[PDB]
Amino acid sequence: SSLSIPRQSLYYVNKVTSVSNVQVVSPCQKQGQTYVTAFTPLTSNVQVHTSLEQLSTIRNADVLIFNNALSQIITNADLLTDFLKNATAIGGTVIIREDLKDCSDKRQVARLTDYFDVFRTTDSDGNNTGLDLYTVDQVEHSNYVEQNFLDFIFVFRKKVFAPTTDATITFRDFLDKTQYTNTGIDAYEWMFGVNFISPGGYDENLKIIKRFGDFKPGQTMLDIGVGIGGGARQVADEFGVHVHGIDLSSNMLAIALERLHEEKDSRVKYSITDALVYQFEDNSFDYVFSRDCIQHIPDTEKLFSRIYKALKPGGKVLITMYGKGYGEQSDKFKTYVAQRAYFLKNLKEIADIANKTGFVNVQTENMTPRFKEILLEERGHLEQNEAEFMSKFTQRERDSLISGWTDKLGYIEKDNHNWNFFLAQKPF
């Protein structure tokens, strides 16, 4: 009904793409027709179809849009795979709007993201093809009007994928299958504190964010690597700041989304997306925040460039991260770094990248002493609540938290692992 809905899809199509035709599959005919109306600036060559059935008829759709067209097949792998084969063969840019509020699995978005992200098939050339994720965003009308936070727009470009060598076939898959499995996330959340996957939980995050200075209601913040959402939720609730959180782990964000849908707050919105892929509007954010994420991101220069452009002039960036100290690296620490796929920088390198990007008023701080305190407290909290922890988790999970925390304390003593703080400003 509301034209804002299909116009949101047009906005993403513009981001990822000229276009000679748009094919829309929408069981709801009235809604389908709003896409014809909305897409005129791009092209008037927009046709609506009532059914997936009619999908195999279609060919050569520069843009292919599904509007609540999958509700009957979501829980069926076989039918989903059939859909994916057709969609990939037929579409250039593929948009899937699907309302998941009524799914029995309140984290269905992660299952769908995974299925769509890893699907591969051979085209007529015997080439390896699939869908390349741009983002999974929330329908803004739904967030702001109905307070339905589980209505999604999946945005993909069909492409030929170069051959891969690992057991996981995308970085998204690597995150969700390795460090940020659902069990992994649950264990971490117990260790760090409710809603957090970062040192010291709520109270530590609040201390850190207050370093931005004086917040004003309605200012905007981008949170890079927002995890299960505790930081985003905290800044909205404490300061009335509107947070756009992004994360490439669908397992992490599916939990954040579930919790937002339960405890509604339209100051917060989330995107399943890579920080180096999503295209933010220039000069749009008052703040960019990243809490213990960017050790995961190799191309720090590109990241810092994208942050600089997205900030308003005078806007501030605050990043905390795992980094490296200046001690000679132990073989044990190198093994950890490789298994986590961390790309660690020291504070001199961070300062240099910030200078080269254009940031001013740079402040860096080595918070490793505080990290040591927190690690000791967290390990102690687990070691003194074994009964409770053992009632929710396995011995294997208890052991990996105790030993991993002990490992990190060791890495600190060798000055291998540091906890680094970076705060800077886009010039006025």
Ligand X SMILES: Nc1ncnc2c1ncn2[C@@H]1O[C@H](CSCC[C@H](N)C(=O)O)[C@@H](O)[C@H]1O
Binding site for ligand X (CB under 6 A): 175, 180, 196-198, 225-227, 230-231, 246-249, 252, 274-276, 291-293, 296-297
- Asked if 3 touches a copy of itself (CB under 8 A), the answer is yes
Q: Of the candidates 78, 166, 216, 391, which one interacts with a copy of itself according to CB under 8 A?
A: 216
| DSSP code for 99 | E
Task: Indicate which of a copy of itself, ligand X, none lies near residue 194 (CB less than 5 to 8 Å, by partner kind).
Answer: none
Is the Cβ–Cβ distance between 4 and 28 less than 8 Å?
no
C-alpha atoms less than 13 angstroms from C-alpha of 48 in its C-beta half-sphere: 17
For residue 415, the SS3 value is: coil
Answer for which of 203, 237, 377, 386 binds a copy of itself (CB under 8 A) is 237
Alpha helices in 218-364 (DSSP H): 230-239, 250-262, 300-310, 331-340, 347-357
Q: According to the annotation, is 228 in a ligand binding site?
A: no
Instruction: Report the nearest approach of a copy of itself to the CB of residue 344 (Å).
Output: 35
Closest CA to 329 of 412, 400, 402, 405: 412
245 is in an annotated binding site: no
**Token pair of 371 as six digits:** 């990290």
User: Closest CB to ligand X among 63 and 185?
Assistant: 185
204-233 burial code (b ≥16 CB/10 A, e <16): bbeebbeebeebeeebbbbbbbbbbbbbbb
With respect to ligand X, which residue has the nearer C-beta, 171 or 393? 171
Q: What is the DSSP letter of 53?
A: G
* Least gap, CB of 181 to a copy of itself (angstroms): 32
Q: How far is the CB of 357 from ligand X (least distance, A)?
A: 17
Task: Quote the CA–CA distance of 60 and 55 in Å, as a whole number.
Answer: 11
Per rule CB under 8 A, is residue 217 in the interface with a copy of itself?
Answer: yes
Is 326 known as a binding-site position? no
Amino acid at 369: P
Burial bucket for residue 335 (CB in 10 Å: 0-12, 13-18, 19+): exposed
Q: Which is nearer to ligand X, 66 or 190 (CB)?
A: 190
Between CA 418 and CA 421 the distance in angstroms is 10
Q: Closer CB to a copy of itself, residue 184 or residue 201?
A: 201
What is the Cα–Cα distance from 280 to 125, expressed in whole angstroms? 35
**x/- site string to a copy of itself, residues 157 to 196, per CB under 8 A?**
----------------------------------------
Q: Are 8 and 139 contacting, i.e. CB atoms less than 8 angstroms apart?
A: yes
Instruction: Kindly state whether residue 312 participates in binding a copy of itself, applying the rule CB under 8 A.
Output: yes
313 contributes a contact to a copy of itself by CB under 8 A: yes
Report the partner that residue 210 touches, choosing among ligand X, a copy of itself, none (CB closer than 5 to 8 A by kind). Answer: none
Contact flag: residue 98 with a copy of itself (CB under 8 A): no
Asked if residue 306 belongs to a known ligand binding site, the reply is no
Select 146 or 349, whichever has its Cβ closest to a copy of itself. Answer: 146
Q: How far apart are CA 3 and CA 11, in angstroms?
A: 12
Residue 392: name its binding partner from a copy of itself, ligand X, none (Cβ under 5 to 8 Å by kind).
none
Residue 249 interaction partner, one of ligand X, a copy of itself, none, beta carbon < 5-8 Å per kind: ligand X
* Long-range Cβ contact pairs of 372-379 (< 8 A, separation 24 or more): 372/409, 372/412, 374/199, 374/200, 374/204, 375/199, 375/405, 375/408, 375/409, 375/412, 376/409, 378/191, 378/192, 378/199, 378/405, 379/405, 379/406, 379/409
When the beta carbons of 173 and 258 are compared against a copy of itself, the nearer one is: 258
- Phi then psi for residue 121, to 5 deg, are -155, 160
Binding site listing: 179-180, 188, 197-198, 225, 247, 274-275, 291, 322, 336, 340-342, 408
Binding site for a copy of itself (CB under 8 A): 2-4, 7-8, 11, 41, 140-141, 144-145, 147, 214-218, 236-240, 264-267, 281, 283, 312-314
Binding site listing for N-methylethanolamine phosphate: 179-180, 188, 322, 336, 340-342, 408
Binding site listing for S-adenosyl-L-homocysteine: 197-198, 225, 247, 274-275, 291
